[PDB]
């Protein structure tokens, strides 16, 4: 009824992937919100593609939906901030700290102060809590592990992590059934199908 | 044969638009390269979304495919540069001038020098050739007009500007034919279609 439309999206998702339309697959996953591709999320996080990682998340949850989603966005924006410090771009880190991290101040005033004070350090590994995190690759990996747990525990992600079991190219198969159902009415056959755009006829 | 796949993409494009999956439509248009959505290109240019405008173009042509495409990319990157000057961000303008505009130096050494020398001006409208362009909205509009002509003349865009004439929701209609063709084999009916994922049966 509406599950026709929802299911048809999954057939299209499968079709798009089989056609290697990679970018189109994940935009659809996001805009439909029907399926969260963890394998892809893992990739992009390792690549530190934070804007895309956040934009992909945004088809599933906002920063303040629940405590799980908020911790997910927090860890992402924290690491984004630290990486700026690690390349000594203290200007970018400030930008991050105000535009991205300030939203979390309301909920924990002191943690925002503490993370702000990491700017003044010659190296943030002077802070005992953060004396641990290097290099970037490992931290991301350690973060990804936590992000995975947070996602797999997040209510808004529970039944969106497993793609339906389907035969290969289900949509193409259905399109064939449609052509059969068109050809069976032809008066009569004859297999010179001209288009999918209008029903085929034989004469 | 392969036009099955190509046509099926157009059915999906139409389906995606009817489902208001706006971002997914244009990624597909771009990744497939089958259809250039001028209406969308116009929008984004007016919004000055240059990175997206360029990324959308990139599914159709590279900067150096032909003289038309190159003039398209040039005008886009020129305006992007001027806008930076107009907000007195001479740092961004330099970044643009090296990373984006330098490729055009090879083909016209002197024009690259001339555009570089617009940095040193208190206001680029001191140059007689550029004494004309304000404000941004109008220039974009004037540029869009030229970009439209360039696109409609570009060989790589000739037969990609007109979307095929289709009845509404062609794909949904075909999916129905598929269900009919499944139900006609049931032994016998009975309309309680459970899924699109596996063929329906009646028993």
């Amino acid at each position: 009824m509406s599950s026709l439309s929802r299911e048809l999206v999954f057939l299209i998702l499968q079709f798009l992937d089989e056609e290697k339309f990679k970018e189109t697959v994940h935009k659809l996953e996001q805009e439909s919100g029907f399926f969260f591709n963890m394998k892809y999320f893992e990739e992009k996080v390792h690549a530190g593609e934070w804007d895309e990682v956040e934009k992909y998340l945004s088809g599933f949850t906002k920063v303040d939906d629940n405590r799980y989603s908020m911790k997910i966005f927090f860890e992402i924006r924290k690491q984004k901030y630290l990486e700026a410090l690690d390349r000594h771009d203290r200007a970018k880190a400030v930008d991050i700290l105000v535009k991205d991290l300030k939203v979390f101040s309301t909920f924990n005033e002191e943690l925002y102060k503490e993370i702000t004070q990491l700017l003044t350090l010659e190296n943030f590994r002077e802070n005992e809590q953060l004396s641990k995190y290097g290099d970037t690759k490992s931290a991301r990996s350690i973060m990804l592990i936590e992000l995975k747990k947070l996602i797999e525990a997040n209510p808004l992600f529970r039944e969106k992590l497993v793609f339906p079991t389907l035969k290969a190219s289900r949509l193409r198969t259905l399109i064939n059934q449609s052509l059969n159902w068109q050809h069976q009415l032809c008066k009569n056959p004859r297999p010179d199908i001209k288009t999918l755009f209008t029903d085929h006829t034989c004469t | 044969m392969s036009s099955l796949s190509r046509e099926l993409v157009f059915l999906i494009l139409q389906f995606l638009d009817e489902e208001k999956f706006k971002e997914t439509v244009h990624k597909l248009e771009q990744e497939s390269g089958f259809f250039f959505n001028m209406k969308y290109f116009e929008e984004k240019v007016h919004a000055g979304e240059w990175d997206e405008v360029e990324k959308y173009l990139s599914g159709f042509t590279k900067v150096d495919d032909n003289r038309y495409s190159m003039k398209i990319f040039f005008e886009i990157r020129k305006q992007k540069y001027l806008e930076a000057l107009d907000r007195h961000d001479r740092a961004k303008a330099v970044d643009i001038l090296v990373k984006d505009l330098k490729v055009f130096s090879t083909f016209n050494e002197e024009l690259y020098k001339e555009i570089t020398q617009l940095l040193t001006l208190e206001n680029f409208r001191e140059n007689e050739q550029l004494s004309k362009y304000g404000d941004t909205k109008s220039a974009r509009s004037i540029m869009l007009i030229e970009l439209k002509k360039l696109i409609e003349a570009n060989p790589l865009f000739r037969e990609k500007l007109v979307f095929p004439t289709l009845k509404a929701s062609r794909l949904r209609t075909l999916i129905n034919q598929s269900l009919n063709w499944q139900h006609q084999l049931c032994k016998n009916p009975r309309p309680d279609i459970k899924t699109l994922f596996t063929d329906h049966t009646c028993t």
Binding site: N176, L179, N180, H183, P191, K194 | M1, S3, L4
Partner: peptide
Amino acid sequence: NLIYLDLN
């Protein structure tokens, strides 16, 4: 010009 499987 399109792939068509006749079943059957």
